[PDB]
Design a protein around this nucleic acid. Structure first.
Ligand SMILES: [Mg+2]
Ligand SMILES: [Zn+2]
Ligand SMILES: [Zn+2]
Ligand SMILES: [Zn+2]
Lengths: 477, 49, 34, 67, 49, 44, 528, 48, 257, 115, 43
RNA sequence: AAAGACCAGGC
C-alpha cells in the first residue's frame, strides 16, 4: 500500500486484496477492472489536509493537479473486490469525529456521496427526494431532452439534429453539472410552472402551456434532416448523373415539381420545400433514362438550410443536403421536468386565459397536481420552491443530493423574506372570470425539457396506399 | 503497409490531440466534444464496454 | 491543518481537480491509447 | 443561443438588458443587484437573464462559410 | 435481453460508486445496460513484471 | 453556377462532369452559395 | 424455407391471417379533452381528410354528395374517389375532371371523414374488449386524438406519449354493428366483474369530493354558469337550499340535477367511520359521510371513488343498470363538464405546504423511530446472547428477521398514522386520498414520516459484500440502517445508503414492470 | 386421507394432477375452480 | 337594470407604468378590461420579413422571429393605419404597413452587435423603441445580414408579438374580506401592497353583503404604446366590439321579426 | 400541419353570422344566443351585466370547446319582457358604462400630468 | 414474494393453466376429526 | 427498392 501510495514500483491502477479469514492475498494488474478514487484515512483523520486544498485552489499556473494529489498518497483508486476489505465513511465531518461508538477503524472516506450517480442522473435536482423509478425515468428521458447537442452543429450534416432556440441553465442546479458541461450546452428552459387543476386539459400526465409564451419562442426548436446522394457507375453504359430532368427525357417520372432544382439537380439553400418536393435530381441511363430523384418526407414543409457537394471514397460526386424546419410546440409535443414528470401538452392558452398572480405572472406550464402523490416526486416540488427562491435572490440554487445544509424549512424561510408565502403557494386569479381561485396555487419556476417525441413525427393516416409485393398487404411503417 | 486502423477521436494518435479551444474551432470542431468515438464512413461509432 | 465545516468546499474542489485532469471519457481514450 | 427578447411569461423587454447585465456583473454588482439595477422586478424576468447562456459567443468562434 | 432471469438485472451492492444506480434503460434491457458513475475509472492494464 | 469552398471560402464556377477541386487550395468540399430567389418569412 | 415462412410469428398464418395490416387506419398521440362527450373522439383534420368512407349516392343524398364531389379533395369536407357502377375508380385528386363529376343513383362516392362518423378507437395491448370500443368522430384542430377522461380507464391510457389506433369501418353493415355492439356507452358495464370500467377519475373526482361537502355554497351567478353545462337540464332553476338572508345553492343541491331520472343508491364515503352505524346519528352523519340518493336527488353525504368510481353498486353503476347506456353517457359528460367548470372557481393544487407536518408531529415520528431502533437493537442483542427462542417451523435467522420486520412495520404504520392524523382538512394530499382520485395512505406516510423498509426478493437488503451491505457498514450489521430501512421521508431526503437501497427497491419494481410482458401475453394468447 | 384422525372430507391439496389421479375429474373441476379463485381473488380483485 | 357609475383614481403614472384603481364596477368588467389590455389592443409589430443575405450563425426564421418581437412605437398612427386584410391594396401599402430595412455587414475583427437601431423605417413616427438597444444578432467579421421587413397592425389575439403590455397586475379585495380564497393558515400569508389593515390582524372580517369592487390595476407597457394610451385603446376597442355586437344583434332581430 | 391560422379567434370568413338567436322550447321566455368568433371577454361581460336586470330570470355564458371560438349565452326573462330586448339593453348599458369609464379615466390622466 | 410459502400470482396461474406435473410449492391442507382438532397434543 | 440483420427509443 505504501508503494502504491507513493507510486514507486506499483501504479495506482493496480489493486491489492487481503482476504484475512481465507488467508489469500490477491494482486490484480489486468485491464477492465472498475475502480474509483477514495480518500485515505489514517486513524480517524483524513490525509487530505488544508495545504492540499490551498494548492488545488491555486491549480491554475501552479502545475499542481489531481495527479500530484494521487502521488502524495492522499487519494487512492479502489476497485470492487478491494472495496470488500475497505471501510468507508460518508463524510469526514460526520463519521470521523468521536461519538457514540459505532466504528473507529475507518480506512477510507468518500470524496462526495453524490459521485455514485451517472451522467444523466446527476442532472436531477434533489434526486434523494424522488422515488427511485422516477429518478430512472428522468435519467432515461434526459437523453431525449432537446437542446444544443454540440456547438459546431452548423457544420455537421447528420439526420435528425434537434436544436432548441433558447436553452437555459437550470435555476436549481447540482454541483455535478459543472463537470458535465451542462451549463454550456443546456437542454431545456426554466419555466414558471403552476401545479394546479385549471380546465381539465392537464389531467392524467398532460400539461397546459402558455400560448403567449410559446409565441415568444418558449420551447421553440429546429429540426435538421440530412439527405445524402451518391453518383455511381455500375453498368457498362449505366451511370448516375446529377442533373435537372425535363418533362420527357426520362421514362420514370413523378408528378412532383422539378423546377426548384438548379442546373446540376441540387436545390440551393434558402428554398422552401414542402412534401413531395425533389431534393436531388438524379437520372439512370438504362441499357431512354430512368429518374431516381430524392423527394421530401411527407409533410415536412421545411427550408433547405445547407447544401454540400463533394467526392466520396471512389471519387464520384457526393451530395449532402440538410433541410431545416422550425417546429413551434403544439399540443402533441412531449414535455418532461427533471424528475420523471412527463406528459404531452393538453392545450395552449394565451396570456389572457391563463391564471395570473397579483403581479401579473402567468404560468408558462400548468401540470396536474394528481401526478405528484402517486408518482412520488417530492424533489419536483422542492426544486420548484428552490427556483422561486433563487430567481428572487439572484443566486443559482444548489440541489446537490446529499447536502444536509439545505432544508425545506430553510428554503421556506428564505422565500418568506421576499414577500411570498413561505410554502411556495400563491393566490391565483381565474383567467376567464377574474375571480380569485379559492385554493392557493403552488407556482414557481421549474426546469422543463422538451423531448424529441413530437406529434408531427408520429401522426399517420392510411387509405389504400402502397401494398407489399409478396403478401399484397399494406406496407409496414 | 499492412492496413489502416481506425483512430478514436481525441486520442493520443488523433489529429485533434493537444489542440486548444481556438485550434479546434479553427478546424470546425467543437471544443466541448468529448471525443472517444470512431468515425467510419462518416458515421460516429462508439464502442460499448 | 484540517478542514472542519469547510468540507463542502474542499470535496468539490478536489472533484473539480479530478474532472479537470481526466474528463468524462478518459476511459475510452486510455483504453485505445493502450 | 442568443438572449431572447420579450421575457416569456409577461413579455417585458429583456433582449436589450443582456450586455448591461454582463457589465454590471463584470464590474461591481452581484447577480441580484444587477437584476435590480436593470429594473427586472418580477422573477419571471429575472430568471430570463439569470438562467441565460450565451452560446452566440461560442458559435462566433468558427470561421464563416463565406469570407 | 429476452431471458426472463431477473437476478442479473437487479441492482447489486457491488455497484455502489462505480455504476449509476438510477440510470438504466426501461424495457427488455433493464439492468443489463449500465451507465458509469462520475468517478468510476476502468483499469487500463499493466504488466505485472 | 458558383460553389463555395470549405477552407478558403473563394467563389469558383464549375459545371457538371468536372471534378471538385477549389482553386489555390485543392479542397474537396463545396457549398451551394444560397440562392437569389426570395423567400417570404412570417415573423411569428 | 417454407416452414420458416409459415411457422413463427410474422409467418404466413400468425402474421398475415390472424393479424394483418389494414387500410383506413390512423394512429397518433392522445391528449385529454374533458369537453368532449364520452363516446366522442377528437380527430385532426389531416387524418380525417386522408381517411375516406364510401357512400352510395341516393336521391335523398345526391345533392349533398354532389356538393362534396364539387369541393374535391382540396377542401376538407370533400370526396377522394367516385366509384362507377362498373367498379372502375375515378380520382378527384388529379385536376378538376369536369366530365366525371356527374353523379347518378348507384355510384359510390368516398367522402372524407366528417363529424358524427363512427370509428373504432383502440390502444394496444388490447387486454379486454373494452380496450377497443367504437367512438364518434369530432373534428378538432391540431394533430392529437382527444378522448374523454372517463374513457381513459378502459384503455388503461395516460396522456404522456400514449399512441392510439383509429379504425374506420367502410360499410354501413359494419358501422351499424359497431354502433349497436361496441359503442362506448354500451361498454360501461363489464361482464368480467359486473362493475363499470368507466368512472369519475382524476380532477373531476377530487373536485366532486370537495364540491359535495356541506360547506359548498354557490351564489346565483355561479349556479347559472354551472347549469348551462348540464346537457340534460330542463331549464328550471331549483330553489336554493338557503333563501334568506341571501340565496345560496349547495353543491349537493346542484349535483342532484346531474343525477338522471330517479336513481336510488346508498354508498359510504372513504372517511366514514364504523362507529356511526352502531351508535346514534346513523342517519344524521355528523361528518357528512355515507351517501344517500333518493328519487334521483343527492339527499346527503360526500361523494368519492366509492360512489362515482369503478366499483360494484357504485352510483354510476346504478345509473347504468336503471336508466341505460345513453343516459349514463350523458350523466358522465354532465358530471365532467359541470364539475370541471366549478373547479375553475375553487381550484386544486399540490405543493410543499401539503407535504409538511407540524413540528409536534415530526417530534412524535422521530420518537417512534428512535424507539423502533432501540427495540431492534434489543432484539439483535438478544439474538447475540442466544436468548431468542426460534418459533416453530422457522430457523433462528428466520425468526430474527420476522421479529425485526414486525418491529419495523409497526414503526412505519405508527408513523404513518401519526402523520395522517396531523393533516388539516385543507391539506391536498389528504384531499386526493379521501377523494380516491390518486395516491394512497402509504403515499402520504412515505411523503411525510418514513419511506420504510426496502426489500429485495421479499427480504431485507442482502449482503452483497462479505457479510455487509455496503463498505460503510461494519460486518454482521443487522440493524435497520444497514439492512435497508429508511428512516427519512421524501420531504426530508434520503441518506446516501438509504438512497442506494431505495434505488435497489425501485430497480426490483422496474424489473417486475418490464417482465409484466411476454409471459402474461402468452397466458392471454394460450387461454383464448 | 387414509390416516386416522384425518378428515377424509375436507382434506384437499393445491396440486391438480394428483387430485385427478385420486379424486376423479369432477373433483378436479371443483379444485381447479377453487385454486383459480384463490390466485385471482388474493389481490382482492373479483372475477365473475 | 342600469349601469353603476365607476370612478377612477390613478396613483402612479410613468412612461413605463400606470397604477390606477377602478371603483364601483362589476368583477367581469374589470377582468375583461384586463384581458383586453393584453389581447384586443391594436399595435404595430413586424409580421412580414424577407431576408436577402444572412451569413449569421442564426437561421433565417430565427432572425425573423427575433425581429417580430421587437416593439415599435405605435402611440399615434396605430389608429390611422388599417389592417392589411381590410386594406384595399394587395400585398402591402403605406396606408396598411410600415417598411423596415436592415443592412449590416461586420468588417472589423471585433464582433458587431446588430441591434434594433439598425432597423431603418420609412416613417419617422415608428421607431423600434430607441429615443438600451434590443439585440438581434451578433456578427463576426465576414458575416452579413440584409433583410427587408414590413410591420402590420395587429392585436394580442393573433400573436404575442402584438402584446402592447408587460405583466398586467390585477387585484381586488387585497384584504380577504369576500373570502373568495380561504387561507388554511392566514397568519403566514404576506399582506398585499394595497392592504388597509393593521399588522396585528391577518384578514378583514367576512363581509356577507359585499361584492368585488375597487379593482387595483398596474399596467406596465412594453414601450410600443404609452401605458395610458394602452388603457384608452383597450376601452375604445372593447366599446367598438360591443357596438359591433349591438349592430349585428339589431340586424338579426329585424331579420327574425 | 393541422395548426389553424392565427385569425380564427376573431375573423369571420364567408358564411358565419356574428350572432345567432334560437328560442328555447324547454321553458317560456328563454333564448339561446350563439356568438361566433368570440371568447370569455364578451361572454363574462354579458353574463355579469344581464344579472343586474331584475327582469332577467336566467343569464350565463359558456364556451362549448376552447379549440373552437364560439359562445352560447342563455337568457330567460319574466313574462312580457323579451330576452332579446334584455340583451340589447345590456349591450347599451355596457356602451354607456365603457364610455363613462373612458371619459373619467381620461380626466384622471389629464389631472395626473401637471395637476 | 409476500413459513408456509405458496406460489401465487402469475407463476401459480402458469402452473394451473399448464397443468404442471411438478408444482414449485405443492402443498396439502389437513383437517382433523376428533380431539386432534382441538387438543394440540393429538395434533 | 424490395428482404433481412443489428441497434436505439415510445407506451
Ligand atoms: Mg403512459
Ligand atoms: Zn417577465
Ligand atoms: Zn478552396
Ligand atoms: Zn395597403
Amino acid at each position: 500500500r505504501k508503494l502504491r501510495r507513493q507510486m514507486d514500483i506499483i501504479v495506482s491502477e493496480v489493486s491489492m486484496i487481503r482476504d484475512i479469514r481465507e488467508r489469500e492475498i490477491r494482486i490484480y494488474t489486468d485491464a477492465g477492472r472498475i475502480c474509483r478514487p477514495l480518500l485515505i484515512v489514517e486513524k480517524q483523520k483524513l490525509l487530505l489536509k488544508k495545504r492540499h486544498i490551498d494548492q488545488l485552489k491555486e491549480r491554475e499556473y501552479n502545475n499542481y493537479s489531481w495527479q500530484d494529489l494521487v502521488a502524495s498518497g492522499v487519494v487512492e483508486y479502489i476497485d470492487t473486490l478491494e472495496e470488500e476489505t475497505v471501510m468507508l465513511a460518508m463524510t469526514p465531518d460526520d463519521l470521523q469525529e468521536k461519538e457514540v461508538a459505532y466504528c473507529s477503524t475507518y480506512t477510507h472516506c468518500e470524496i462526495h456521496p453524490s459521485m455514485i450517480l451517472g451522467v444523466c442522473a446527476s442532472i436531477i435536482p434533489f434526486p434523494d427526494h424522488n422515488q427511485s423509478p422516477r429518478n430512472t425515468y428522468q435519467s432515461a428521458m434526459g437523453k431525449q431532452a432537446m437542446g444544443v447537442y454540440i456547438t459546431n452543429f452548423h457544420v455537421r450534416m447528420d439526420t435528425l439534429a434537434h436544436v432548441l432556440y433558447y436553452p437555459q441553465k437550470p435555476l436549481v442546479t447540482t454541483r455535478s453539472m459543472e463537470y458535465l458541461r451542462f451549463r454550456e450546452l443546456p437542454a431545456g428552459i426554466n419555466s414558471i410552472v403552476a401545479i394546479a387543476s385549471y380546465t381539465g386539459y392537464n389531467q392524467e400526465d398532460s400539461v397546459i402551456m402558455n400560448r403567449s409564451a410559446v409565441d415568444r419562442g418558449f420551447f421553440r426548436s429546429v429540426f435538421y434532416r440530412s439527405y445524402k446522394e451518391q453518383e455511381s457507375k455500375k453498368g457498362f453504359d449505366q451511370e448516375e448523373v446529377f442533373e435537372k430532368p425535363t418533362r420527357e427525357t426520362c421514362q420514370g417520372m413523378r408528378h412532383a415539381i422539378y423546377d426548384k432544382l438548379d442546373d446540376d439537380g441540387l436545390i440551393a439553400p434558402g428554398v422552401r420545400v414542402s412534401g413531395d418536393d425533389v431534393i436531388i435530381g438524379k437520372t439512370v441511363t438504362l441499357p431512354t433514362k430512368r429518374d431516381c430523384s430524392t423527394f421530401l418526407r411527407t409533410s415536412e414543409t421545411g427550408i433547405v438550410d445547407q447544401v454540400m457537394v463533394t467526392l466520396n471514397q471512389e471519387g464520384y460526386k457526393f451530395c449532402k443536403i440538410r433541410v431545416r424546419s422550425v417546429r413551434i410546440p403544439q399540443i402533441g409535443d412531449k414535455f418532461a421536468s427533471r424528475h420523471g414528470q412527463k406528459g404531452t401538452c393538453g392545450i395552449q392558452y394565451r396570456q389572457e386565459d391563463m391564471p395570473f398572480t397579483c403581479e401579473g405572472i402567468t404560468p408558462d406550464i400548468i401540470i396536474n397536481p394528481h401526478a405528484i402523490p402517486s408518482r412520488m416526486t417530492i424533489g419536483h416540488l422542492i426544486e420548484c420552491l428552490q427556483g422561486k427562491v433563487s430567481a428572487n435572490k439572484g443566486e443559482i440554487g444548489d440541489a446537490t443530493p446529499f447536502n444536509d445544509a439545505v432544508n425545506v424549512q430553510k428554503i421556506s424561510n428564505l422565500l418568506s423574506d421576499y414577500g411570498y408565502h413561505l410554502r411556495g403557494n400563491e393566490v391565483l386569479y381565474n383567467g376567464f372570470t377574474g375571480r380569485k381561485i379559492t385554493s392557493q396555487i403552488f407556482i414557481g419556476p421549474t426546469y422543463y425539457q422538451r423531448l424529441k417525441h413530437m406529434v408531427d413525427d408520429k401522426i399517420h393516416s392510411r387509405a389504400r396506399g402502397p401494398i407489399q409485393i409478396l403478401n399484397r398487404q399494406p406496407m409496414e411503417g | 503497409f499492412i492496413g489502416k486502423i481506425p483512430i478514436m477521436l481525441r486520442s493520443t494518435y488523433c489529429l485533434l490531440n493537444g489542440l486548444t479551444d481556438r485550434d479546434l474551432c479553427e478546424l470546425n470542431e467543437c471544443p466541448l466534444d468529448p471525443g472517444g468515438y470512431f468515425i467510419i464512413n462518416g458515421s460516429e461509432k462508439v464502442l460499448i464496454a | 491543518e484540517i478542514t472542519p465545516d469547510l468540507w463542502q468546499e474542499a470535496c468539490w474542489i478536489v472533484i473539480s481537480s479530478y474532472f479537470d485532469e481526466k474528463g468524462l471519457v478518459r476511459q475510452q481514450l486510455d483504453s485505445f491509447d493502450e | 443561443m442568443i438572449i431572447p427578447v420579450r421575457c416569456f411569461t409577461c413579455g417585458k423587454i429583456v433582449g436589450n438588458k443582456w450586455e448591461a447585465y454582463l457589465g454590471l456583473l463584470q464590474a461591481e454588482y452581484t447577480e441580484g443587484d444587477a437584476l435590480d439595477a436593470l429594473g427586472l422586478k418580477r422573477y419571471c424576468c429575472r430568471r430570463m437573464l439569470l438562467a441565460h447562456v450565451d452560446l452566440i459567443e461560442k458559435l462566433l468562434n468558427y470561421a464563416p462559410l463565406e469570407k | 435481453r429476452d431471458g426472463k432471469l431477473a437476478k442479473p438485472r437487479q441492482l447489486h451492492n457491488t455497484l455502489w460508486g462505480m455504476v449509476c444506480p438510477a440510470e438504466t434503460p426501461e424495457g427488455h434491457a433493464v439492468g443489463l445496460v449500465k451507465n458509469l458513475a462520475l468517478m468510476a475509472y476502468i483499469s487500463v492494464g499493466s504488466q505485472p513484471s | 453556377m458558383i460553389y463555395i469552398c470549405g477552407e478558403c471560402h473563394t467563389e469558383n464556377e464549375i459545371k457538371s462532369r468536372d471534378p471538385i477541386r477549389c482553386r489555390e487550395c485543392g479542397y474537396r468540399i463545396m457549398y451551394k452559395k444560397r440562392t437569389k430567389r426570395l423567400v417570404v418569412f412570417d415573423a411569428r | 424455407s417454407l416452414k420458416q415462412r409459415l411457422k413463427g410469428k410474422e409467418g404466413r398464418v400468425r402474421g398475415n391471417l390472424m393479424g394483418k395490416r389494414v387500410d383506413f387506419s390512423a394512429r397518433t398521440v392522445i391528449t385529454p379533452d374533458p369537453n368532449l362527450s364520452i363516446d366522442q373522439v377528437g380527430v385532426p383534420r389531416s387524418i380525417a381528410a386522408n381517411m375516406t368512407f364510401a357512400e352510395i349516392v341516393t336521391p335523398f343524398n345526391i345533392d349533398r354528395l354532389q356538393e362534396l364531389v364539387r369541393r374535391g379533395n382540396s377542401q376538407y369536407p370533400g370526396a377522394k374517389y367516385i366509384i362507377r357502377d362498373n367498379g372502375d375508380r375515378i380520382d378527384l385528386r388529379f385536376h378538376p375532371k369536369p366530365s366525371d363529376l356527374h353523379l347518378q343513383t348507384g355510384y359510390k362516392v368516398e367522402r372524407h371523414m366528417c363529424d358524427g362518423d363512427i370509428v373504432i378507437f383502440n390502444r394496444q395491448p388490447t387486454l379486454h374488449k373494452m380496450s377497443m370500443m367504437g367512438h364518434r368522430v369530432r373534428i378538432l384542430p391540431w394533430s392529437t386524438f382527444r378522448l374523454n377522461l372517463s374513457v381513459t380507464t378502459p384503455y388503461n391510457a395516460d396522456f404522456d406519449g400514449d399512441e392510439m389506433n383509429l379504425h374506420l369501418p367502410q360499410s354501413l353493415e359494419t358501422r351499424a354493428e359497431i354502433q349497436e355492439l361496441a359503442m362506448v356507452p354500451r361498454m360501461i358495464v363489464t361482464p368480467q366483474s359486473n362493475r363499470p370500467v368507466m368512472g369519475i377519475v382524476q380532477d373531476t373526482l377530487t373536485a366532486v369530493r370537495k364540491f359535495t361537502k356541506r360547506d359548498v355554497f354557490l351564489e346565483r351567478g355561479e349556479v347559472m354558469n354551472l347549469l348551462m353545462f348540464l346537457s340534460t337540464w330542463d331549464g328550471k332553476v331549483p330553489q336554493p337550499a338557503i333563501l334568506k338572508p341571501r340565496p345560496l345553492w349547495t353543491g349537493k343541491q346542484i349535483f342532484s340535477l346531474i343525477i338522471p331520472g330517479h336513481i336510488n343508491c346508498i354508498r359510504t364515503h372513504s372517511t366514514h367511520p364504523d362507529d356511526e352505524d352502531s351508535g346514534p346519528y346513523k342517519h344524521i352523519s355528523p361528518g357528512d359521510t355515507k351517501v344517500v340518493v333518493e328519487n334521483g336527488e343527492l339527499i346527503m353525504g360526500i361523494l368519492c371513488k366509492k360512489s362515482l368510481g369503478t366499483s360494484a353498486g357504485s352510483l354510476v353503476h346504478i345509473s347504468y343498470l336503471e336508466m341505460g347506456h345513453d343516459i349514463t353517457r350523458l350523466f358522465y359528460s354532465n358530471i365532467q363538464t359541470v364539475i370541471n367548470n366549478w373547479l375553475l372557481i375553487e381550484g386544486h393544487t399540490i405543493g410543499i405546504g401539503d407535504s409538511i407536518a407540524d413540528s409536534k408531529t415530526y417530534q412524535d415520528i422521530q420518537n417512534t423511530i428512535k424507539k423502533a431502533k432501540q427495540d431492534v437493537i434489543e432484539v439483535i442483542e438478544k439474538a447475540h446472547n442466544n436468548e431468542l427462542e426460534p418459533t416453530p417451523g422457522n430457523t433462528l435467522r428466520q425468526t430474527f428477521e420476522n421479529q425485526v420486520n414486525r418491529i419495523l412495520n409497526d414503526a412505519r404504520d405508527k408513523t404513518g398514522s401519526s402523520a395522517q392524523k396531523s393533516l388539516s382538512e385543507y391539506n391536498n394530499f389528504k384531499s386526493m386520498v379521501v377523494s380516491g382520485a390518486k395516491g394512497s395512505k402509504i403515499n402520504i406516510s412515505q411523503v411525510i414520516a418514513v419511506v420504510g423498509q426496502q426489500n429485495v426478493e421479499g427480504k431485507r437488503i442482502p449482503f452483497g459484500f462479505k457479510h455487509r451491505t455496503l463498505p460503510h457498514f461494519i460486518k454482521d450489521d443487522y440493524g435497520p440502517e444497514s439492512r435497508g430501512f429508511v428512516e427519512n421521508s421524501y420531504l426530508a431526503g434520503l441518506t446516501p445508503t438509504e438512497f442506494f437501497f431505495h434505488a435497489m427497491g425501485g430497480r426490483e419494481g422496474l424489473i417486475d414492470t418490464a417482465v409484466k410482458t411476454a409471459e402474461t401475453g402468452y397466458i392471454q394468447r394460450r387461454l383464448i | 386421507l387414509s390416516e386416522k384422525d384425518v378428515d377424509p372430507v375436507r382434506t384437499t391439496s393445491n396440486d391438480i394432477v394428483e387430485i385427478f389421479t385420486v379424486l376423479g375429474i369432477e373433483a378436479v373441476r371443483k379444485a381447479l375452480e377453487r385454486e383459480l379463485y384463490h390466485v385471482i381473488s388474493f389481490d382482492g380483485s373479483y372475477v365473475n | 337594470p342600469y349601469a353603476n357609475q365607476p370612478t377612477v383614481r390613478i396613483t402612479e403614472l410613468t412612461d413605463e407604468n400606470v397604477k390606477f384603481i377602478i371603483e364601483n364596477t362589476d368583477l367581469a368588467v374589470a377582468n375583461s378590461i384586463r384581458r383586453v389590455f393584453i389581447a384586443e389592443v391594436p399595435i404595430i409589430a413586424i409580421d412580414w420579413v424577407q431576408i436577402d443575405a444572412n451569413s449569421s450563425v442564426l437561421h433565417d426564421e430565427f432572425i425573423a422571429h427575433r425581429l417580430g418581437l421587437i416593439p415599435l412605437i405605435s402611440d399615434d398612427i396605430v389608429d390611422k393605419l388599417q389592417y392589411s386584410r381590410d386594406c384595399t391594396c394587395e400585398e402591402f401599402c403605406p396606408e396598411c404597413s410600415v417598411e423596415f430595412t436592415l443592412d449590416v455587414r461586420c468588417n472589423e475583427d471585433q464582433t458587431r452587435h446588430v441591434t434594433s437601431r439598425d432597423l431603418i423605417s420609412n416613417s419617422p413616427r415608428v421607431i423600434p423603441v430607441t429615443s438600451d438597444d434590443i439585440l438581434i444578432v451578433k456578427l463576426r467579421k465576414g458575416q452579413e445580414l440584409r433583410l427587408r421587413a414590413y410591420a402590420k397592425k395587429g392585436f394580442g389575439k393573433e400573436h404575442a408579438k402584438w402584446n402592447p403590455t408587460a405583466g398586467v397586475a390585477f387585484e381586488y379585495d387585497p384584504d380577504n374580506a369576500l373570502r373568495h380564497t380561504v387561507y388554511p393558515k392566514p397568519e403566514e400569508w404576506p399582506k398585499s401592497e394595497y392592504s388597509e389593515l393593521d399588522e396585528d390582524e391577518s384578514q378583514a372580517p367576512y363581509d356577507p353583503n359585499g361584492k368585488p369592487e375597487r379593482f387595483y390595476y398596474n399596467v406596465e407597457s412594453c414601450g410600443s404604446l404609452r401605458p395610458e394610451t394602452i388603457v384608452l385603446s383597450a376601452l375604445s376597442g372593447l366599446k367598438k366590439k360591443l357596438s359591433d355586437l349591438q349592430t349585428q344583434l339589431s340586424h338579426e332581430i329585424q331579420s327574425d321579426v | 400541419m393541422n395548426a389553424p391560422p392565427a385569425f380564427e379567434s376573431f375573423l369571420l370568413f364567408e358564411g358565419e353570422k356574428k350572432i345567432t338567436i334560437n328560442k328555447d322550447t324547454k321553458v317560456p321566455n328563454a333564448c339561446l344566443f350563439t356568438i361566433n368568433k368570440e371568447d370569455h371577454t364578451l361572454g363574462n361581460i354579458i353574463k355579469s351585466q344581464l344579472l343586474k336586470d331584475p327582469q332577467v330570470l336566467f343569464a350565463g355564458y359558456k364556451v362549448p370547446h376552447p379549440l373552437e371560438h364560439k359562445i352560447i349565452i342563455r337568457v330567460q326573462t319574466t313574462p312580457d319582457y323579451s330576452p332579446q330586448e334584455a340583451f340589447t339593453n345590456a349591450i347599451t348599458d355596457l356602451i354607456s358604462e365603457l364610455s363613462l369609464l373612458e371619459e373619467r379615466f381620461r380626466v384622471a390622466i389629464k389631472d395626473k400630468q401637471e395637476g | 414474494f409476500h413459513a408456509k410459502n405458496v406460489t401465487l400470482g402469475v407463476p401459480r396461474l402458469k402452473e394451473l393453466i399448464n397443468i404442471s406435473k411438478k408444482p414449485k410449492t405443492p402443498s396439502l391442507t389437513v383437517f382433523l376429526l376428533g380431539q386432534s382438532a382441538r387438543d394440540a397434543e393429538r395434533a
